[PDB]
Amino acid sequence: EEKLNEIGYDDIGGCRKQLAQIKEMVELPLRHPQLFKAIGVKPPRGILLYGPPGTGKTLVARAVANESGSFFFLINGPEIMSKLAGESESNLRKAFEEAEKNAPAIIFIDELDAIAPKREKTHGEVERRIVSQLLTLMDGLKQRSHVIVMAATNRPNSVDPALRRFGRFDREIEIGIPDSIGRLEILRIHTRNIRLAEDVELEKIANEAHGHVGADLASLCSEAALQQIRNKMAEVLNSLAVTMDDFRWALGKSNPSALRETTVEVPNVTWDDIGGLENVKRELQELVQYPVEHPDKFLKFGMTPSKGVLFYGPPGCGKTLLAKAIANECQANFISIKGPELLTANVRDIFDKARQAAPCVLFFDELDSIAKADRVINQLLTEMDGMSAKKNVFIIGATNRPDIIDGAILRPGRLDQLIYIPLPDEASRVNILKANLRKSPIARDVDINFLAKATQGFSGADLTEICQRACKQAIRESIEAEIRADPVPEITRRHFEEAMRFARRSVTENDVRKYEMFAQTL
Amino acid sequence: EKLNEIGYDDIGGCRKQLAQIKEMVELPLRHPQLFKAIGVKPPRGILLYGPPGTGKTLVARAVANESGSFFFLINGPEIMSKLAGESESNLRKAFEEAEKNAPAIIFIDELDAIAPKREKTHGEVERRIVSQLLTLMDGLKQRSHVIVMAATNRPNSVDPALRRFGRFDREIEIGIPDSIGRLEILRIHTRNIRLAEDVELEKIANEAHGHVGADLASLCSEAALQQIRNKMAEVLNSLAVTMDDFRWALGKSNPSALRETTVEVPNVTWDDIGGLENVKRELQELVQYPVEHPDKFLKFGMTPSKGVLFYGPPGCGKTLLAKAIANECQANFISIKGPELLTANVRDIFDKARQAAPCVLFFDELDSIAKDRVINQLLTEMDGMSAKKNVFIIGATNRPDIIDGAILRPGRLDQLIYIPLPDEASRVNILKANLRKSPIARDVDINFLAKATQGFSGADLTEICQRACKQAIRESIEAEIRADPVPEITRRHFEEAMRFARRSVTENDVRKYEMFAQTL
Ligand SMILES: */C(=C/C(=O)Nc1ccc2oc(-c3ncccc3C)nc2c1)c1ccncc1
Ligand SMILES: */C(=C/C(=O)Nc1ccc2oc(-c3ncccc3C)nc2c1)c1ccncc1
């Protein structure tokens, strides 16, 4: 009782932008109705929160209610649907009547898809009755009454379309997987009572906890604390403090439930990691950054920003790292979609998730798998064709066979600019080598400049693999020396020499000429 | 009190339809004697359909309040949320009270809930309520003055028995508003909001594409909220929404009617594209004369040919020409594309055209459909198209060879028009129209560019012009970061743009089209 009435914004983690949105949408209207009524802002009536399970979207409504001083009423879908025919209707009606009786109030309908699934899923007559009663109650909320209905679901498609119309649920907020900062916030919240040793660095755990949601991180802390019992099992109880090794063990064996869900975050890849050419850097900056950062010039000179690119070139890491870097430059969200993912209605969903994030780079890797000289490609054409050119969403394609791409996806207004990504030059190769080996020690004798001079035409994967091989050899001698017995603390020159013998190339001039002729034809 | 005060002025975006409903539902219910004497039978069922968010839910109440009739409201969800017998009791009571208080209007909001397609309604009570509605509808005597109005998203969702003669014969589509309708909606929604002196709602109306009235209300709310943001008793009094707030709201609005087809008179004129005088005269003959001079057509007893297949090099002039000819005649323009059809929608499109007596139905990328289900479905619908109705079909294909010889028969599209590369005058017009919105330097001579640019397609010219502005923006930022050093697009920008300009149609393609023309 007391605990639930004392959770606020600090006790919810992983959603800080959405939390600010909801604060502005709800708390301010319910604290100063006079101002909004005077200026003429209509407070929202229905807010549908959706996202993967375990994201903490079940606490947002209660946090807002507690921090705004508004009466909070909770409706559980399973609880309503577990009652008899008339009792469920009575409970819904009583919920809304009580909310109106004491206002301002917030009504939270957990698992809305249980009460109001798609009409096809519903088979009986009582279920349609409860859906219709919910619609009637929603439409019965006067603009004066200060009742805001908040609903939680996994996918809004699972809810009956009649509920998502205007006046019932017109605002939808997605509370998705948290980023590194969100994961760190969640870990701090969950470790508020667990005693931790002096060697815990929650930042590393947050950075390495990919595909984790709030619920998963709670399990990770529980598992890490459990092992501290195993190793150590009054004085024993007092000497218990979770250690970094326990956290690493827990993270290694944890199966996150959100590995397959697309991520939307600003990538941590900069220009220096990849290097790149000045021409391509300037071109990408012109195409993307200026519309986002300098719209005044654009409107002044009255041009519509062209918002489509088709990266084409050799097949390595070149095109995707460039897209992530340009996204990082503008602090814009990055959405990466591969051909296999699309091949396996989802096109509209991905475009909607792009439109939700205003500055966004939508990457379509392996575009050839879809656009080739049938249902999916038409969907991509129509969805992108009906994309307003005044919205800061940039669609960046990528294909290693630019001659198999149909002309429909290159028709101006869809993707009107083609950029070539050549084999990295000497400076680019130096940058790639340094970036790959940053997280490993290198003997002072090893000179990356000479290696870059020797490596001509090696693709990005090659340099990564050359580094992996030279390292893989280092582990072998480390074990071999250990078995014989830090005899080998650094990756000396000999390791790179013997790792630079059976590495020849991955794409020779034989296929470079293909792209270099395609360039001349364009 | 507030509901009873709603009138015609309080609904926006449906001026034509509201005039139609006026002539259908007010003049009769106000002067029954005249209509009875002449022999006009007032309608008994009117089904208003369209996208959500429109004022189609308020048309019935406006008509009731302005005609003095008694208004009764039936909600689909409310009726269907009751028990087995209470739903029928409510419907019967509604109709009985309407008959008692005649003249009256019965509005059934969300008819699809009460009477969805019979494939649905797996239960037995739902069929009972649908049959009760049908029985009540058939029970309205012609002498009684009860008019039943209904609202739905798509009439296909309603039971086909409800849409017969005598139940719901008339069907009015209240759809996405045009620029004037959007301006009316904005004026209605901003009657209480305080507006600054620097706000001109015409621009907002023009730029708010795919916006229904609800979206415009949301836009106004967001603009006011951003004013509150930027500014947070004197503070209360010093709040006035500003043009910047409206532009922000437009920028970050997500309208719900982007994917819905538009039916409006395009704002494209001949001067924006030029075109050959031959093509202009031919299009005039085919389209304008039947619409503007039908007496002569009847006099000479010649049935006008309805159909053209524009063929030529890819670009924009096959679509802009259709828009221009539609604009000349103030006729509606419907633009369909191959991607849309590939994904019976054809009958729906043809009905949305037949609804508008004068129209120009444009089928772009026709090669995709023609050379199996769709093409035959497209052929049959046109073959069943009366030649005396002012619906013109204007196809457009960039590869006139792959098109089957079936679409090109003399009841179907029976005329071929060639749209060549724009001549010098056409290029001058295209260049001038493209940069009408961009401040140009007085030194630039578009005539010289037109002389130099030979064979460049419409897209090419637009791209050449876009590059010239891209150079201008870069120089503006470069000067700004170094520091209006670059107020206008100078000649040098155009020179740089031309330096790497490339023709988009090879002379081989021009020769191929010339050979095809010689074939005809
Ligand atoms: C780097 C590469 C990537 O994501 N994909 C990729 C695609 C194709 C490919 O072929 C090779 C190859 N290299 C050498 C010899 C033979 C072959 C087939 N490597 C690749 C790699 C990357 C991008 C983003 N993040 C991490 C890595
Ligand atoms: C103009 C054109 C349009 O709507 N579509 C279109 C079709 C084909 C096409 O090819 C190019 C092109 N141009 C230069 C080089 C390469 C290519 C493939 N551009 C287009 C454009 C238009 C009509 C109506 N409203 C606005 C624009």
Side-chain angles (χ1 to χ4, degrees):
Chain A
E1 294 179 351
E2 289 180 350
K3 300 180 180 180
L4 290 181
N5 284 23
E6 291 177 353
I7 61 173
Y9 303 107
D10 295 330
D11 292 332
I12 300 171
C15 54
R16 53 188 195 286
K17 304 174 200 156
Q18 293 94 353
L19 192 60
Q21 269 176 54
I22 289 168
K23 183 176 175 64
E24 211 171 15
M25 279 168 44
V26 174
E27 182 168 0
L28 274 295
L30 299 188
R31 287 191 303 180
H32 318 322
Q34 62 195 0
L35 176 68
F36 284 58
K37 192 174 195 171
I39 178 61
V41 189
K42 62 180 74 65
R45 319 170 71 194
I47 315 172
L48 179 70
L49 313 164
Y50 65 94
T55 53
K57 64 185 175 68
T58 303
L59 295 155
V60 176
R62 176 150 261 153
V64 173
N66 292 334
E67 295 291 334
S68 302
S70 65
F71 172 82
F72 183 77
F73 196 98
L74 177 65
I75 300 168
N76 288 319
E79 186 176 0
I80 286 293
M81 301 300 271
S82 79
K83 301 290 186 294
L84 295 157
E87 196 82 349
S88 71
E89 307 290 337
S90 177
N91 293 127
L92 275 181
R93 185 181 61 252
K94 186 179 177 177
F96 275 83
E97 287 186 319
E98 185 177 359
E100 292 180 354
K101 182 173 72 67
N102 47 5
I106 292 171
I107 302 171
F108 186 56
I109 304 170
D110 197 356
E111 293 181 357
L112 188 70
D113 52 17
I115 302 176
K118 292 176 70 176
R119 185 179 296 275
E120 295 179 353
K121 294 168 175 177
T122 291
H123 187 273
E125 294 179 353
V126 171
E127 293 164 341
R128 286 161 196 145
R129 284 226 300 277
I130 195 73
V131 174
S132 297
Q133 183 66 41
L134 187 58
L135 290 167
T136 310
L137 288 157
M138 293 285 291
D139 290 334
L141 289 173
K142 307 171 190 174
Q143 298 177 339
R144 289 186 179 178
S145 66
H146 314 272
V147 176
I148 309 173
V149 181
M150 307 192 69
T153 180
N154 284 337
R155 288 164 296 114
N157 292 312
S158 62
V159 174
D160 202 20
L163 278 164
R164 301 172 68 189
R165 295 179 64 258
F166 292 89
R168 297 165 181 164
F169 287 106
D170 55 2
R171 298 294 300 273
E172 292 163 13
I173 309 174
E174 180 169 358
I175 295 172
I177 299 169
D179 55 15
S180 299
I181 302 169
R183 289 189 288 245
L184 180 51
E185 292 175 346
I186 296 175
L187 279 170
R188 288 204 153 90
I189 297 169
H190 283 123
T191 60
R192 217 174 277 175
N193 300 328
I194 305 187
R195 182 178 174 85
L196 303 173
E198 295 294 334
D199 56 305
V200 293
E201 297 203 342
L202 293 162
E203 294 77 2
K204 292 185 176 64
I205 300 304
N207 299 335
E208 294 181 354
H210 297 281
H212 278 51
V213 291
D216 290 326
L217 294 157
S219 176
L220 181 141
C221 295
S222 177
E223 286 288 321
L226 182 61
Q227 175 135 358
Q228 189 63 253
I229 306 299
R230 294 176 191 167
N231 296 348
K232 298 293 181 65
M233 184 178 178
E235 62 186 1
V236 178
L237 188 151
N238 292 118
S239 61
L240 281 184
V242 185
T243 58
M244 196 74 202
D245 294 329
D246 296 330
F247 267 104
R248 294 182 182 279
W249 186 98
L251 180 60
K253 288 188 178 182
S254 53
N255 289 320
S257 70
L259 282 170
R260 317 186 184 286
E261 293 175 357
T262 56
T263 304
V264 186
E265 65 187 1
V266 64
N268 58 5
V269 179
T270 58
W271 290 111
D272 294 329
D273 285 10
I274 58 172
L277 284 70
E278 277 182 34
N279 291 320
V280 64
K281 193 178 173 178
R282 292 181 184 272
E283 190 174 23
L284 292 173
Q285 281 180 307
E286 274 183 350
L287 273 68
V288 169
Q289 187 175 39
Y290 294 171
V292 182
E293 293 181 354
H294 317 82
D296 302 359
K297 318 308 198 79
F298 264 95
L299 182 55
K300 161 168 180 291
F301 284 99
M303 154 165 64
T304 183
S306 58
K307 284 180 170 148
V309 187
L310 180 62
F311 283 142
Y312 70 101
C317 306
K319 293 170 238 172
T320 191
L321 308 166
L322 265 296
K324 288 181 179 65
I326 189 67
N328 176 22
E329 171 71 12
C330 299
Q331 300 295 355
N333 295 118
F334 184 73
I335 301 170
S336 166
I337 297 296
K338 305 180 153 151
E341 302 166 352
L342 294 173
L343 269 298
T344 291
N346 275 7
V347 178
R348 192 175 302 181
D349 276 307
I350 190 71
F351 268 96
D352 295 4
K353 184 169 67 70
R355 263 154 162 286
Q356 180 157 238
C360 181
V361 171
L362 191 59
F363 197 96
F364 281 109
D365 194 340
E366 298 185 356
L367 193 66
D368 59 357
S369 294
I370 297 155
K372 62 182 182 180
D374 293 337
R375 294 178 62 189
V376 178
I377 187 63
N378 294 119
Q379 285 191 274
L380 183 60
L381 295 173
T382 183
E383 290 291 334
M384 173 162 40
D385 184 73
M387 179 69 70
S388 76
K390 271 156 155 158
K391 190 173 284 294
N392 310 327
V393 65
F394 306 87
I395 298 160
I396 293 175
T399 184
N400 54 3
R401 329 186 193 199
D403 55 2
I404 306 299
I405 195 73
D406 61 354
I409 198 66
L410 276 298
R411 223 169 296 283
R414 298 167 167 180
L415 295 173
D416 195 17
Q417 306 167 88
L418 286 72
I419 308 185
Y420 176 55
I421 303 298
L423 278 298
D425 297 330
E426 170 163 2
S428 298
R429 284 183 297 266
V430 164
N431 295 28
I432 296 163
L433 273 158
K434 288 192 192 209
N436 280 119
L437 295 172
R438 181 175 180 174
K439 316 303 174 180
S440 77
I442 300 90
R444 300 148 197 157
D445 293 330
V446 179
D447 53 335
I448 303 299
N449 293 116
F450 164 77
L451 181 63
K453 290 179 181 180
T455 57
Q456 309 91 0
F458 288 77
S459 81
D462 304 331
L463 276 299
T464 306
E465 196 180 1
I466 292 188
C467 295
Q468 296 270 6
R469 292 166 178 183
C471 186
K472 198 189 302 306
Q473 184 177 358
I475 292 89
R476 167 163 40 187
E477 285 102 22
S478 193
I479 302 179
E480 283 193 348
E482 191 195 323
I483 298 297
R484 292 179 184 278
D486 291 352
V488 287
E490 290 175 350
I491 305 165
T492 61
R493 184 179 296 108
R494 183 177 182 178
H495 299 202
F496 288 98
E497 286 192 3
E498 292 178 2
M500 191 181 63
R501 183 62 61 85
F502 60 96
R504 278 86 183 192
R505 207 158 293 180
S506 175
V507 293
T508 67
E509 298 182 0
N510 192 6
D511 62 3
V512 164
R513 286 180 177 174
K514 196 185 101 174
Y515 309 102
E516 286 189 356
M517 293 305 306
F518 181 88
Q520 290 182 335
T521 54
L522 272 286
Chain B
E1 297 182 0
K2 297 181 180 180
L3 281 169
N4 296 116
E5 190 173 1
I6 298 169
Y8 296 104
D9 293 330
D10 295 330
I11 315 178
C14 63
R15 59 190 181 281
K16 298 174 183 60
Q17 284 95 5
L18 250 179
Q20 191 173 355
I21 289 169
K22 209 152 183 172
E23 290 188 1
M24 281 196 200
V25 181
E26 169 162 308
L27 301 177
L29 286 186
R30 294 191 62 86
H31 312 136
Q33 62 194 358
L34 174 65
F35 285 66
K36 193 157 188 168
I38 183 61
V40 174
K41 49 198 172 87
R44 54 181 56 244
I46 313 175
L47 182 70
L48 311 167
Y49 63 102
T54 319
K56 74 187 177 186
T57 302
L58 280 167
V59 177
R61 189 173 293 279
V63 173
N65 286 330
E66 294 275 282
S67 73
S69 60
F70 164 84
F71 186 81
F72 200 102
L73 179 74
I74 301 168
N75 276 279
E78 185 176 1
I79 286 284
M80 297 299 265
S81 83
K82 300 294 186 292
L83 296 161
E86 188 174 359
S87 304
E88 287 74 359
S89 177
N90 293 336
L91 277 180
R92 285 197 316 268
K93 176 152 176 193
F95 275 87
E96 288 176 353
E97 192 173 358
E99 292 179 355
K100 193 164 73 79
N101 296 317
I105 291 166
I106 304 175
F107 187 59
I108 303 169
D109 197 23
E110 293 182 357
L111 187 72
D112 59 357
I114 301 173
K117 236 165 182 179
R118 190 171 287 274
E119 299 167 2
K120 276 72 71 174
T121 72
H122 302 110
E124 197 277 334
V125 175
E126 290 145 348
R127 295 187 187 94
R128 300 230 313 275
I129 192 70
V130 173
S131 293
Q132 179 81 311
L133 186 56
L134 291 167
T135 290
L136 290 155
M137 290 292 294
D138 291 338
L140 293 172
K141 297 184 175 182
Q142 281 183 335
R143 298 176 184 175
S144 75
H145 304 280
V146 164
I147 300 169
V148 185
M149 309 194 71
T152 181
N153 286 336
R154 281 160 271 192
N156 303 313
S157 64
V158 178
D159 208 22
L162 273 300
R163 318 219 271 114
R164 293 174 66 261
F165 298 96
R167 287 157 179 182
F168 280 106
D169 55 316
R170 294 183 181 277
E171 274 166 44
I172 315 165
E173 190 179 47
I174 307 191
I176 296 161
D178 57 12
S179 298
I180 300 95
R182 291 191 287 249
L183 177 54
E184 283 175 344
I185 298 162
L186 286 169
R187 288 209 166 94
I188 295 167
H189 284 142
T190 60
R191 282 213 274 263
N192 307 345
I193 305 181
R194 184 175 176 86
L195 263 59
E197 294 77 2
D198 63 354
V199 68
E200 292 178 351
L201 297 158
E202 294 78 3
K203 295 182 177 64
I204 302 307
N206 297 342
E207 300 192 40
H209 296 282
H211 274 63
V212 176
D215 294 331
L216 295 166
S218 177
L219 186 155
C220 293
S221 174
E222 290 287 307
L225 186 54
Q226 175 133 359
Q227 186 66 241
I228 297 294
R229 285 198 210 107
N230 295 351
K231 295 296 179 63
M232 312 285 179
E234 55 174 358
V235 179
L236 302 174
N237 296 1
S238 63
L239 292 173
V241 181
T242 309
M243 199 67 208
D244 308 310
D245 298 328
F246 271 101
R247 293 183 182 281
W248 182 101
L250 272 176
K252 289 184 179 178
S253 62
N254 223 319
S256 68
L258 283 173
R259 319 193 182 286
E260 278 206 1
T261 315
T262 307
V263 168
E264 64 184 2
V265 177
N267 58 4
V268 181
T269 59
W270 290 109
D271 295 329
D272 292 330
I273 59 174
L276 299 172
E277 183 61 21
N278 186 4
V279 181
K280 178 176 173 63
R281 291 182 184 273
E282 184 162 346
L283 268 170
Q284 285 179 0
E285 277 181 358
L286 270 298
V287 171
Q288 179 157 30
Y289 290 172
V291 181
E292 184 63 13
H293 299 98
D295 47 46
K296 296 184 179 65
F297 272 82
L298 212 62
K299 182 178 184 295
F300 285 99
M302 182 270 294
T303 318
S305 178
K306 312 267 188 191
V308 187
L309 187 152
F310 284 149
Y311 68 107
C316 305
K318 281 187 296 191
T319 307
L320 280 70
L321 288 170
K323 273 180 210 178
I325 190 68
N327 173 26
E328 175 82 353
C329 300
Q330 299 305 271
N332 296 122
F333 183 73
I334 298 168
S335 178
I336 304 296
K337 301 184 159 302
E340 307 192 42
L341 292 175
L342 294 160
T343 58
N345 299 0
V346 180
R347 290 200 293 273
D348 297 315
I349 295 296
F350 271 93
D351 293 330
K352 184 169 71 69
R354 185 181 295 272
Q355 282 277 116
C359 184
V360 166
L361 187 54
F362 192 90
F363 279 117
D364 188 64
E365 283 170 316
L366 193 62
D367 55 358
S368 299
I369 292 301
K371 168 166 294 312
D372 302 0
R373 301 178 178 180
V374 174
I375 181 58
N376 290 319
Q377 185 176 181
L378 182 61
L379 293 173
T380 183
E381 178 56 23
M382 293 180 296
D383 288 336
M385 187 70 198
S386 64
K388 298 293 292 184
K389 189 172 283 294
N390 304 334
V391 178
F392 281 98
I393 300 167
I394 295 176
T397 189
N398 59 7
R399 51 185 307 179
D401 295 328
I402 198 165
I403 194 71
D404 60 356
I407 290 278
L408 298 173
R409 286 181 166 212
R412 298 152 184 172
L413 306 182
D414 186 57
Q415 288 191 351
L416 307 178
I417 286 172
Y418 174 54
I419 304 304
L421 277 298
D423 203 358
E424 60 88 16
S426 296
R427 290 187 294 273
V428 163
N429 309 326
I430 298 161
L431 277 157
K432 290 174 67 177
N434 273 290
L435 291 72
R436 181 177 181 170
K437 279 75 72 176
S438 62
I440 306 300
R442 304 149 194 165
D443 282 295
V444 165
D445 292 350
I446 303 303
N447 289 88
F448 171 83
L449 296 173
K451 293 179 181 180
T453 51
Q454 182 61 39
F456 289 82
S457 74
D460 306 335
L461 273 297
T462 303
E463 212 182 2
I464 295 177
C465 305
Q466 295 262 49
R467 294 174 179 179
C469 175
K470 287 181 181 181
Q471 301 290 324
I473 296 171
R474 161 161 57 179
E475 294 180 354
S476 186
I477 182 172
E478 270 169 10
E480 182 178 312
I481 184 169
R482 272 174 179 164
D484 286 355
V486 188
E488 50 186 19
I489 298 89
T490 311
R491 295 177 63 87
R492 294 183 180 177
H493 304 163
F494 280 98
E495 296 200 335
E496 292 159 1
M498 290 183 292
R499 274 178 184 175
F500 61 101
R502 183 67 59 82
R503 296 161 82 273
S504 295
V505 288
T506 61
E507 183 63 21
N508 206 349
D509 293 330
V510 177
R511 293 179 67 184
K512 181 174 70 177
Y513 290 119
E514 286 176 353
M515 289 298 293
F516 181 88
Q518 296 162 5
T519 301
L520 302 169

